[PDB]
Symmetry: D3
Subunit: 189 residues, 6 copies
Amino acid sequence: VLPGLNYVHSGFPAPGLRQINRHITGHDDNGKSVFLSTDHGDHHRIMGEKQAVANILYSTQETPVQLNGNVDIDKAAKEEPPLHYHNGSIVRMIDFAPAVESPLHRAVSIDYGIVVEGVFKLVLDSGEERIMRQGDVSVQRATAHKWINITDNGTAPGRMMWILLDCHDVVVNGQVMEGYLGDLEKEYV
Amino acid sequence: VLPGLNYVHSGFPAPGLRQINRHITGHDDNGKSVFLSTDHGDHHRIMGEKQAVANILYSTQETPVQLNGNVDIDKAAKEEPPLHYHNGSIVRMIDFAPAVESPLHRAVSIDYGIVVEGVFKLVLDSGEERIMRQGDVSVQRATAHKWINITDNGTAPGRMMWILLDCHDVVVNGQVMEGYLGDL
Amino acid sequence: VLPGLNYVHSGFPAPGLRQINRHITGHDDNGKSVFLSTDHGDHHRIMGEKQAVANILYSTQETPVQLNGNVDIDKAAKEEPPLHYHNGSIVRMIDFAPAVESPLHRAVSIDYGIVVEGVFKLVLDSGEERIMRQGDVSVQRATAHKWINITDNGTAPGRMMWILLDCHDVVVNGQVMEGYLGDL
Amino acid sequence: VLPGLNYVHSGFPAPGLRQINRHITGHDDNGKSVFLSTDHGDHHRIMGEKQAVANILYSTQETPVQLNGNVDIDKAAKEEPPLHYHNGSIVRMIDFAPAVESPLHRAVSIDYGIVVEGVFKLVLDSGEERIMRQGDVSVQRATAHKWINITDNGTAPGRMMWILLDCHDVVVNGQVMEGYLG
Amino acid sequence: VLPGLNYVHSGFPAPGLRQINRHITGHDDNGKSVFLSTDHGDHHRIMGEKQAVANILYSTQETPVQLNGNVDIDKAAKEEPPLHYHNGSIVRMIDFAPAVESPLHRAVSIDYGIVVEGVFKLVLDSGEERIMRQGDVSVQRATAHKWINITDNGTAPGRMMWILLDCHDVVVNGQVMEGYLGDLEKEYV
Amino acid sequence: VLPGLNYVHSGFPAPGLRQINRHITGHDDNGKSVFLSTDHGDHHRIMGEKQAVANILYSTQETPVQLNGNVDIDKAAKEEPPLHYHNGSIVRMIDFAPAVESPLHRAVSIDYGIVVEGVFKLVLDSGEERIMRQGDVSVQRATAHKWINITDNGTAPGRMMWILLDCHDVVVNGQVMEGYLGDL
């Protein structure tokens, strides 16, 4: 019995989770600050056997970010970003079906994670774990981890949000700690 | 009478809001991923007349981030960051006392904002406004803006979180839109 | 200014409200009771200027209900039902944008209503009114009424669910109280 | 050992669940739509060894419903309805004590069910199941089933509401699927 | 318009508020500690025009309390208690209909109060005021005050609990701050 | 492993629970009722290996309480109170870390306890148990017991509040039911 099989029958948001509002601000051609768009995000991707849906709320591809000509908005909208942009950022929101586990993986990236709804178990490859509840924040520094939805004893969906930044390769005793994705590689090709 | 006057009496968290847990992961000498610390953030700063309190959960000063020797941790904890870091990031959580309202201002920054708890009204300098409830996200693109806590008709506290990133100067029709800190 | 202009930007569900699961049971080869469908409902209809979205959870067009060969399933899915079915039922769920309110209307219908999420004001053409919160239940006996979403002082979406049954024309003082659809 | 033994100690509502409002509208003598009632429902019945309590919010005994002279209100309040009405409807609300199970049963009836509070498990006679959280909707088409209240790992109460309508008898492979009460 | 007119149609609890569980413990004839009762409280009382309902969870009429022979249980169930007991305690829970105000009054007793559900406003005779949300605690030291239910802009019910203990008379510069109940004398003894 | 080991890293409130407002009223020099203080309680005390934290909201030391000259306020602030006060009262609030248990103990006092947030299990020395959810009240009459935090399957913090009053020694079969603190 695979957890969360076919739970996500309508893309984002997953059943039991609220639809969201993404506001994007900008400047008109008279210098006034205006609201450019209100939507449900972008680049909704169904993951696993319909066990989770991802939602890319924004992305940047350069540092510092160029906002003139609304170039940043169109680079974010015209292409589905990969796991992680070099010298840039991605804001990734994921809806988890009940009891759904992500594979133990490592992205070479510093990742600010915040639980938006539910309870999540952050497990590392050393066995160490932390239970993270709503509002809890993590600073994942290119470490090997897996995320586990444990909301209501594995019967409720949960939602998490990540802001992924670029990092240099972590070296420990002259050895580069290599990034790997396991079963998550099929979800970003 | 000033909104939120002497509401925050014990720093972070503000009355009515929950204490947080911040987890920072790292690497041990053998090469396994380990949890380096669990705490309530860093560099708490009272704002206004005890009308708010800020919480700096992390910050980076270069891109790509240098993680070796835990130097990112050291820089993040050594000194309180300014409004915004060139070629870097800041995670800033803020608790608002009831009905507390920020000054109209512009930071030359792109800001990812999420409403962690409460109901906030985002006001831009053109009068355009959007009410933001828990879970709603904004991409503030170097815009002159104002944040208003309106949770439960101005009787409850609210909490926001921003991730502030470095951007180039926004130039509209030849004129640099310069950022002002302002005051109400 | 319209109460909910362009709030519902992605159909059902409305922003701030949860996606649902609709489960339909049935019988298989050898008379085992099984699940036939788990979906988001059927017959989504944007109402107003994206001020509301309606969801038809189920409907029947006859009494008693004919279930053999799954004909009630086919009828319920093959065509979007009207306001109400003669000799039938409709399970219609509606999401209201903030402060959105229905026009003063009458249906020749006995409607069971339950507030699923939010707070609503039910006003009759007499002026009498009642505030209904979650779990509260209404039996509208072919009366002329309004529904006003008032959740969080007009800043939060709400959701109602109705079961609409057919009824005979109500007659007062020899007058048939004619149903009218008001504005919408 | 019994899941909800002696939990419901004051009728409706059960400990941990909210008291409700039921509003019934009607017409006065000059045609104005007015409110006739505000109460806690009707025909409250304790079930089992005080493991649950039912609340009948309304019922109709004919289709289409006859509203004139308020004879429907009279019929709905004068006698406790049975499990279901022929050519009729019943709105039944049930507060489940923690972990309380419903017996495996079948009624010849189409039931619209909505979780009002808590988390329930819907098990059918073939073993298949679906977990239903607040706001989820089920259409029970004369199938054999049970309801298990699993709210907060069996330590919290939950509340369901059903609208039971009449159906024709279900025949599969020439056999009429009989009802039973387990 | 009377704020909570005919809102409490079925006594305790008020519509929109939860029925409760009061557990009372004691000792068996063998010295082991046991649960003596589980119920919805005692001495339910409708206040005003079905505008509120009180629920007296327990009371004591002596200091220190005598628990032998269960005489404190019988004394608490035998009579409905007055506003406050001399040399004793009263745990009074009150369900407020939406927007219901208590009258300005002064009970000569120190009252611990906690908001159980909703948002209440505590206004004092000088006009000073505090908004009290679920979880907040007030220590009422024989002051003249009034409680206002403002839950969800006066459209939702709320619930307060109090523990009323005996105090001496408050004397300010020779003057006795005398008790008075205003409109609330209707609802006691 | 020890439940809640090092969970409460920043005193009161524990991570996951809200900061509180304690309001104390009194009289000014003219005889008007005014608010004397708005704070987070008093006498915060960590318990166990950072597994819980207690917050003494108020206390009295005499019956009836003396309030003139604010003597009761001073007596409540100047000393951290013991387990219970003779002829007096203690309002004790305690924040439990996930899955945290108190030892089987007896205090010779009558305790008015309410669940502020979470779910607790009250186990008595006879093995009988009750599950108490938010808003439920217990009257403890000098009985041997223990408190278990079972909030969200042992993974969430909980909060109780007691009011302890003095009581005469309980005698059962000519033997005094001695109080004891216990050892896990």
